[PDB]
Design a protein around this nucleic acid. Structure first.
Ligand SMILES: Nc1nc2c(ncn2[C@H]2C[C@H](O)[C@@H](COP(=O)(O)CP(=O)(O)OP(=O)(O)O)O2)c(=O)[nH]1
Ligand SMILES: [Mg+2]
Ligand SMILES: [Mg+2]
Ligand code: NA
Ligand code: NA
Length: 326
DNA sequence: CCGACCGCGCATCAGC
DNA sequence: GCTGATGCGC
DNA sequence: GTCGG
């Protein structure tokens, strides 16, 4: 990682605009620029060299100049002194508290972790679990645990039916040696884009993962999506593993390829692929890649039998999971 | 200039 | 109760 | 904040 200083600074700036300014376009601008800079294999030596990058414009470039000259931006160091902004930033780091609730709590005089662990009657279920596992959720998962976690889920799924197919995606499918969480894609033949043949098809999986105590908390559940907590088992007098965010996404089997494409990401990569789908005359979601007419008409689902079928439509040579860590 | 800047599932609230 | 907008997350 | 047209 060649320009950690610059990319860090942009991530700070991005977080501030999102959490404190509630300026979601400025946030996505910083996030893009942080991404392209994070991928560029020269060590940036001036703001001018960095303005040659796309998504880096003038205001970023002058920030990049001030930061190599001094190791800092005073904008950020002011943001770091201001008690109210700092407190907001900090509360967003609890899962389920975003910019709106972070500022509400700070206006209510709730600004630190103690205050939360005392006004829980003001937290909803998600925020409650979030603070409960606050330290754990800040920790990364070494890939070796991801593999450990992978065996449990995939084998517990064949127990409910051997026609379930599960594919870990997220940063694990991109090849990271550490992940924020585990993201799991769920396929069954009896749930095409049409027949809801067997209901509770995703509840089946979840409940079985709860029997064997792999899943231990729930942030949200639905026919298509489960956000919860999981924990690896440990040996005698072996200390416990940290509790981990787990996401499970059930998707029609005949739309699998747009499922993995969505779920391996990254999130920025999907924004750039989907924005480029739009320039080429298509729209892409988790389910389909559709044509557009000059009239805002989301056209008719187009046939894909490979991930690369998606790329060819928008005229992209295939990028391997390792290369979409944008 | 300035319009666009990804697309969706779930929880919760307001309003009726 | 539903519907529609909003927060928050993937 | 940055970009295409
Ligand atoms: N289109 C789109 N896809 C997204 C978005 N956010 C996530 N995804 C897709 C792509 C994303 O890869 C996947 C899971 O998102 P996470 O688990 O939150 C982040 P991951 O990439 O796994 O990295 P980690 O921090 O966990 O190490 O859903 C989004 O905003 N938009
Ligand atoms: Mg992930
Ligand atoms: Mg996830
Ligand atoms: Na530029
Ligand atoms: Na949060």
């Amino acid at each position: 990682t060649l320009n950690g200083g610059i990319t860090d600074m942009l991530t700070e700036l991005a977080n501030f605009e999102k959490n404190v300014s509630q300026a979601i376009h400025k946030y996505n601008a910083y996030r893009k620029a942080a991404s392209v800079i994070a991928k560029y294999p020269h060590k940036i030596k001036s703001g001018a060299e960095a303005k040659k990058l796309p998504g880096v414009g003038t205001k970023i470039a002058e920030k990049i100049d001030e930061f190599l000259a001094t190791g800092k931006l005073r904008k950020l160091e002011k943001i770091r002194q201001d008690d109210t902004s700092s407190s907001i930033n900090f509360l967003t780091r609890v899962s389920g508290i975003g910019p709106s609730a972070a500022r509400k709590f700070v206006d209510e005089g709730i600004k630190t972790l103690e205050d939360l662990r005392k006004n829980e009657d003001k937290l909803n279920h998600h925020q409650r679990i979030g603070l409960k596992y606050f330290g754990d959720f800040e920790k990364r998962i070494p890939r070796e645990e991801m593999l450990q976690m992978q065996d449990i889920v995939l084998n517990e799924v064949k127990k409910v039916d051997s026609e379930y197919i599960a594919t870990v995606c997220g940063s694990f499918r991109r090849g990271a040696e550490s992940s924020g969480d585990m993201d799991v894609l769920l396929t069954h033949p009896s749930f095409t884009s049409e027949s809801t043949k067997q209901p509770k098809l995703l509840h089946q999986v979840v409940e079985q993962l709860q029997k064997v105590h792999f899943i231990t908390d729930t942030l949200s559940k639905g026919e298509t999506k489960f956000m919860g907590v999981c924990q690896l088992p440990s040996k005698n007098d072996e200390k416990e593993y940290p509790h981990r965010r787990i996401d499970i996404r059930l998707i029609p089997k005949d739309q699998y390829y747009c499922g993995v494409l969505y779920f391996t990401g990254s999130d920025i990569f999907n924004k750039n692929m989907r924005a480029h789908a739009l320039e080429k005359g298509f729209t892409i979601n988790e389910y389909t890649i559709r044509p557009l007419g000059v009239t805002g008409v989301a056209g008719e689902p187009l046939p894909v039998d490979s991930e690369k079928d998606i790329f060819d439509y928008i005229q992209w040579k295939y990028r391997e999971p390792k290369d979409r860590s944008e």
